Amino acid sequence: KAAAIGIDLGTTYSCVGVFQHGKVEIIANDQGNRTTPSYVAFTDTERLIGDAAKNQVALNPQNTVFDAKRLIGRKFGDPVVQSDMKHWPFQVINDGDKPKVQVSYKGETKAFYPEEISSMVLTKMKEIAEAYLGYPVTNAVITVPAYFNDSQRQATKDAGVIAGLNVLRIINEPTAAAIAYGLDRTGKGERNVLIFDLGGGTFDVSILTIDDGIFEVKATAGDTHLGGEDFDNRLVNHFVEEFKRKHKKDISQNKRAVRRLRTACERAKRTLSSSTQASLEIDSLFEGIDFYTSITRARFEELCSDLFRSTLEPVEKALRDAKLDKAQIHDLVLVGGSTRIPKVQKLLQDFFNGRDLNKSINPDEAVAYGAAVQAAILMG
Ligand SMILES: Nc1ncnc2c1ncn2[C@@H]1O[C@H](COP(=O)(O)OP(=O)(O)O)[C@@H](O)[C@H]1O
């Protein structure tokens, strides 16, 4: 009788929903947010998950883990792991050919497998659901990228189990997104669906072919290292020069400062999605010197123009691999927190014969939404 949940275990954010009495409910965390950072932090006295973990990153960088989704199901020697390792502030060690994240926790050295860090994020999402329903949740459906291999899917499933969940099914994120928009219920002929999924660290384009209720992955393309964080960094480099020009000081060397700026830029970016301008106010950014400035949407767009325009290439590549003209796509689906960027929406719109965009479901909640539906269906 207990309802099962749908969990979108994202690269940088996670989301949980539950299908109740004919509708899907996206559950808010303790801070009232419908998305939770896929972050786990370890201190001298506690282990933080979600917002609390990401909030103290600037003061505890070596022990605040993220991007566990990039390591999960992979080998220590995998070139992807060795490359990614160079960009993380935490240590990744080898354990019988398997990578482990090593940190300082409660006064000592501890190492964790990717699926262990991920199981911690899953527990948080499980408890959020449990507080809402009022009872224990034991069944779930978890999404993963369509390109994930058997090994990556297995480790993710192991994560759900370690989090005390029976994973009813591991499904593809673009499939989950299709389900959210109800493209899995028509049974009349076949239709072409393109999924434009731009998150905080990754960009995925998926072309699916739904023939009378059956899903078929036609093509996939994108960039696993292109996402919202890259837009934040364009803003960061922008303000570093401005601070450098107004107070004559290069802050690019003070780690804590760069981090506090990146966090401010991230929030400024979001404001630029609904307003033409945004203010950036950081107290004692560098050497006690404050930093209050402003920036227009257009300026922001110019700073990321190349990045935004690059998103159309994976789109055209997918169309090619799937041997379809852009006009042959029946359903254009935009998901991911970054598709909220007016500019990103316009580039896609102009590209796709200036067609109308579907604004019926929340882009950063879409994956969890479809997951919840499938979970309920699987639960009878
Ligand atoms: N209103 C917004 N405007 C611009 N970017 C946003 C907005 N809301 C969220 N984002 C961005 O979307 C990204 C988070 O995407 P999301 O799909 O939720 O997670 P994930 O990275 O785990 O896939 C972040 O880079 C975030 O800054």
Ligand SMILES: [Ca+2]
């Ligand atoms: Ca996402």
Ligand SMILES: [Cl-]
């Ligand atoms: Cl919470």
